């Protein structure tokens, strides 16, 4: 009665804000030559991966869910699942890399300048993209169209990823759970916890508004960890539940709830430019120097 309209309007608003924010961030970071720093390499890579995630995720998961039919072909199914998995992996690994660079910059400030060069950032970004394009290679191979017939004898298809046996399917979803939600989540949580510990020892031990700025940095670090867990807990939980108990998960979650879970996952590509760039003071200082 009102759930498809809410689905369309929320998907449209998140798609608009994500594409607008990521194109603005990419435009500023490749237009202003004074902002070509080491951290902005990671921010540019994150913006590219968020825009790719938005473009290959939101319409190709919205329209076949609304129509209850994957109207595209099999090759489109393969390519879209490949680019969705690759963009998720690149975005997660870029969040981990940003956390590690912030740990180096804040907790070891004199030592980090020796090794936080541009070549180090280029090697990290290249390794991130190469490993994400390598690990998502089963998605073009094993995602296919599953034909089904509607109640009114209407032929329709579903874009489904299926491995030959359930042991490989459970092992694969466990593997992606580990290296896309748990191990990155633990590494990012430990790095930001160490940064918050160092800044809390600084605040407790002691231009007088430094303390306020330190508290804001701690607040944003916590909001980053909390939003990463909030965005990626339901979809990985749903994928693991479908991996181990397929019939009960597809009976419970299919339709509106899986659409809202996927939308909650997709809002990370919208909130990452806002958190990482549009609230940075030096990004907005450089932003006003390119769009007068």
């Amino acid at each position: 009665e009102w759930q498809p309209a809410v689905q369309i309007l929320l998907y449209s608003l998140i798609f608009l804000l994500s594409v607008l924010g990521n194109t603005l961030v990419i435009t500023v970071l490749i237009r202003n030559k004074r902002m070509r720093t080491v951290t902005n390499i990671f921010l540019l890579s994150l913006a590219v991966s968020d825009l790719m995630l938005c473009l290959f995720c939101m319409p190709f998961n919205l329209i076949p869910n609304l129509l209850k039919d994957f109207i595209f072909g099999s090759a489109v199914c393969k390519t879209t699942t490949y680019f969705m998995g690759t963009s998720v992996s690149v975005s997660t690994f870029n969040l981990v890399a940003i956390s590690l660079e912030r740990y180096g910059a804040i907790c070891k400030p004199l030592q980090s300048r020796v090794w936080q060069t541009k070549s180090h950032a280029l090697k990290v970004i290249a390794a991130t993209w190469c490993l994400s394009f390598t690990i998502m290679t089963p998605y073009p191979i094993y995602s296919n169209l599953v034909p089904f017939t509607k109640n009114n004898n209407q032929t329709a298809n579903m874009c489904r990823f299926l491995l030959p046996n359930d042991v490989m399917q459970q092992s694969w979803h466990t593997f992606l759970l580990l290296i896309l939600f748990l191990i990155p989540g633990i590494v990012m949580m430990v790095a930001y916890g160490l940064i918050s510990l160092e800044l809390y020892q600084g605040i407790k031990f002691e231009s007088a508004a430094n303390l306020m700025a330190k508290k804001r940095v701690i607040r944003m670090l916590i909001v980053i960890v909390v939003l990463f867990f909030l965005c990626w807990m339901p979809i990985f939980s749903a994928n693991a539940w479908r991996a181990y108990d397929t019939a009960s998960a597809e009976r419970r979650l299919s339709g509106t709830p899986i659409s809202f879970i996927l939308l909650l996952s997709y809002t990370s590509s919208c909130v990452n430019p806002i958190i990482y760039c549009f609230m940075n003071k030096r990004f907005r200082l450089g932003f006003m120097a390119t769009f007068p």
């Binding site: 995720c57 998961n61 869910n65 209850k68 039919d69 879209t80 699942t81 969705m84 998995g85 998720v88 089904f148 509607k150 329709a156 579903m158 874009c159 489904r160 990823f161 979809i235 749903a238 994928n239 479908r242 597809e250 009976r251 979650l253 299919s254 339709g255 899986i258 996927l262 996952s265």
Partner: peptide, 8 residues
């Protein structure tokens, strides 16, 4: 019917 979903 239309049961299940794409992974991402």
């Amino acid at each position: 019917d239309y049961m299940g979903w794409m992974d991402f």
